[PDB]
Amino acid sequence: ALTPMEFARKYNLLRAGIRRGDAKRVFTMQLGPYWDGFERCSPQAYALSAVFMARMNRDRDAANNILKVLDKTFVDGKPDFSVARPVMKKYQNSELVQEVVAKHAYVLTVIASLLEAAREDGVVPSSEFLWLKPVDRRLWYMLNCVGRQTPYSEVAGPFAHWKAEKEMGRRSLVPMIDEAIRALEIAVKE
Amino acid sequence: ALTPMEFARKYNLLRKDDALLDNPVPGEEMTAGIRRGDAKRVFTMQLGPYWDGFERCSPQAYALSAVFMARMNRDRDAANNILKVLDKTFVDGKPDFSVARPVMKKYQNSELVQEVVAKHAYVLTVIASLLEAAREDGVVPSSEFLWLKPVDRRLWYMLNCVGRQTPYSEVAGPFAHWKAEKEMGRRSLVPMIDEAIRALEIAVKEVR
């Protein structure tokens, strides 16, 4: 993961000081797509959302079966994310899942709160899905920041928006990433 | 992982159908479907380095060997601690393979480890037999070192073929050599990969 300074240099954000308008665009692009149905998600976000929904509904067998298939099919190919389809169909309209999806407007902030909610059922460490680091580094870092106070710079945008939706008490389509800008500005000032 | 046909195509190993060779190399049939010399080179390249001290191995081969040594000596906490540390440090950087050093120091001269290392001459065939012996102590699945696939795909494929009858083509060389060392009952510095060529020939004929 990049250092704040390494991140600022990579995206040409040094004006020290920060190019704030540029940093706003970078962090907004980091935030990724609106949530508008799990079938529009990436296969890896779809499958892991299904694991977390299963755990929230105390279906440990279904959650573990997805994770075991993704680990085994990763041995010699891409993880077979399609195995998650029946678990998604079973739980995407369940009361506990609807309650979490209600609170967040972006794929990345929805799935962060699904992981947080799944950890009410037990431990769900990222060591359960190590294949995610080569498959989708951004989602990997985001999920590994669930439960942390400070994010990696490469997910500071969606992390900030996630916390802002919690603070506001509602989902927000308008990006709320100002805490990422403030944090990067402070870390850059050495 | 490539299928045998995909592998043969990638390395240009297929001969034309209905071959009738004027000058086949030693060990190559006049009607061979595989370029034996080119196949020998590719499978030998897969074998990798001689074993000559674990300190000369890659960091990932070193750390996983330590895990397997610990299981062979019934030290589950030492093994599980390494695996957990490697999973956790993988999150934002390279796995911290140095966590394995005290465990390597403790067990590399142990009776059961010496017996395995005696039997194999290559890093890949030593570590394959160490994994095999570790599984006498319990389950040691590759799902517990899934970071290895992006780190070192050859070692990843090798370790995932321990316990199989048939290897992935990308480690058919070291797999064949591993089995040949078992069959001969001794380590062999001379490469023994003929079975890998033979299996590719059978696989190509069985298609076509």
TrEMBL record, chain B:
Keyword terms of this UniProt record: Membrane, Transmembrane, Transmembrane helix
Superkingdom of this protein's organism: Bacteria
Domain DotM C-terminal cytoplasmic: 38-201
Coiled coil: none
Protein name: DotM C-terminal cytoplasmic domain-containing protein
Residue range from the parent sequence: 158 to 365 of 376
